[PDB]
């Protein structure tokens, strides 16, 4: 490049490490109900939409049912339930568009005088919204077909006395 | 099976002293609060003459100077006998052992705060489940009474009064069971056969 090596900084030898497609567990299928265990939505029942790369998953609540918007989740941090809601009617093109990483990725007087102040809670964009709706209309339309599934997704999971996860069948 | 409780109440009737005390000590070191009732109803294997012989040897053990400091204090109360056993099995000279001893409480009879509570049993220490049918056994309360315990009769009348009140409580429990079962049938007469079959299918 522009500068000739200034010091004896040695280049690293070639690293023989390739990136290969991630293989999710068999329980993870599009439409599986998942149990968020960590984060600000810990203990919450959501629905899986699409499996992303490197262990990431795209889920929704849906928002109108429980309160979880379109978000990413860690497969190791989420528990899969055997119940699988049908995903017919959901736009796969919209699923891909929302699954693109950039969607969730992204000195003056105002800066100097806001220095130190706690930033205000900015509102939700109509695009993140209106896409939440473009998915949830069909998804809840699917939900009302299955009996009590709406209440199941609305309620929050918890462990009771005597409940032993190593024997409990999720 | 491996359950954690706020406090465990153990009815001491029919339990072997050493086995029950060892289990209690292990539970205390694990951090489970344990309280033991009917220490006068505790049981010791062997024969009563063997028990009297050993505890009289313990009485024979005394310090030479004034028996006020460093001398073996012979506590003749059955609860204190159980306490001596658990203390011998507890590292009583360390802070952890002191914490376990503070977590442990032992009583004679069943005061109201624990008679209005549930009592657990330990199968590994039950006399019936542990000792051979032909073997003989003795009572901690009888030993304590014949060595010097003064309040065997006091706990006797208090226990009898508790028996009377518990019998009355059971009678009211019978009446409650009457009403509960009749309500079960009467409600099941119109219990939405669909939901009833749902419960049947799922196993409740």
């Amino acid at each position: 490049q522009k500068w000739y090596p200034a010091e004896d900084e040695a280049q690293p030898k070639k690293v023989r490490k390739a990136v290969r497609p991630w293989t999710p567990r068999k329980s993870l299928q599009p439409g599986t109900v998942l149990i968020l265990l960590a984060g600000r939505f810990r203990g919450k029942r959501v629905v899986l939409l699409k499996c992303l790369d490197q262990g990431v998953l795209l889920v929704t609540g849906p928002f109108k049912i429980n309160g979880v918007p379109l978000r990413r989740v860690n497969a190791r941090y989420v528990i899969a339930t055997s119940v699988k809601v049908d995903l017919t009617g959901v736009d796969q093109a919209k699923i891909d568009e929302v699954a693109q990483p950039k969607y969730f990725t992204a000195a003056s007087e105002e800066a100097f005088f806001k220095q130190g102040e706690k930033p205000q809670k900015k509102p939700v964009s109509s695009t993140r919204a209106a896409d939440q709706k473009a998915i949830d209309k069909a998804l809840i339309a699917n939900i009302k077909k299955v009996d009590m599934l709406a209440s199941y997704l609305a309620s929050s999971f918890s462990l009771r006395k005597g409940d032993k996860p190593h024997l409990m069948k999720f | 099976m491996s359950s954690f409780e706020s406090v465990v109440v153990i009815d001491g009737k029919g339990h072997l002293l050493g086995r029950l005390a060892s289990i209690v000590a292990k539970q205390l070191l694990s951090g489970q609060k344990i309280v033991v009732v009917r220490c006068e109803a505790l049981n010791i294997s062997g024969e009563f003459f063997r028990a009297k012989l050993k505890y009289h040897a313990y009485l024979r053990k005394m310090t030479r100077y004034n028996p006020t400091r460093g001398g073996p204090f012979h506590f003749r109360a059955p609860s204190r006998i159980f306490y001596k056993a658990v203390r011998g099995m507890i590292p009583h000279k360390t802070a952890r052992g002191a914490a376990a001893l503070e977590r442990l409480k032992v009583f004679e009879g069943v005061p109201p705060p624990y008679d209005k509570k549930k009592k657990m049993v330990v199968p590994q220490a039950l006399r019936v489940l542990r000792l051979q049918p032909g073997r003989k056994y003795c009572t901690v309360g009888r030993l304590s009474h014949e060595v010097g315990w003064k309040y065997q009769d006091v706990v006797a009348r208090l226990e009898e009064r508790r028996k009377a009140k518990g019998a009355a409580y059971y009678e009211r429990k019978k009446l409650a069971a009457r009403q509960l079962s009749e309500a079960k049938k009467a409600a099941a007469a119109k219990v939405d056969p669909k939901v009833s079959e749902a419960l049947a299918a799922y196993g409740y």
Partner: protein, 108 residues
């Protein structure tokens, strides 16, 4: 009103360290997880995250709660007791103390 629980963990007790008869190793701790009594259950609970929560009598981030994190790694013995390794060894007076075993990472 929900009137329900918020528990997403399994209770356990830090009991002691990995020790012989007269030699202890604080770097590793022994945990008795509630409800598990067999090596198969311990194998299920292998590789798990662990939190020890305690009070501090002083606020640093607006709270007096402090959490020491660790992991259940491999089972101990045959009674379902498991062995855990933390970033910092558990204090010492936590022998017999309540500990939280999380449900992540999950293989289900």
């Amino acid at each position: 009103p929900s009137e329900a629980g918020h528990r997403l963990y399994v209770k356990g007790r830090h009991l002691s360290y990995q020790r012989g008869r007269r030699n202890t190793h604080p770097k590793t701790s022994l945990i008795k997880i509630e409800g598990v009594d067999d090596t198969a259950a311990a194998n299920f609970y292998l590789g798990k995250r662990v939190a020890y929560v305690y009070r501090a009598q002083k606020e640093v981030r607006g709270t007096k709660i402090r959490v020491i994190w660790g992991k259940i790694t491999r089972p101990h013995g045959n009674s379902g007791v498991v062995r855990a390794k933390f970033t910092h060894p558990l204090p010492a007076r936590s022998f017999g103390a309540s500990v939280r075993i999380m449900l992540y990472p999950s293989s289900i």
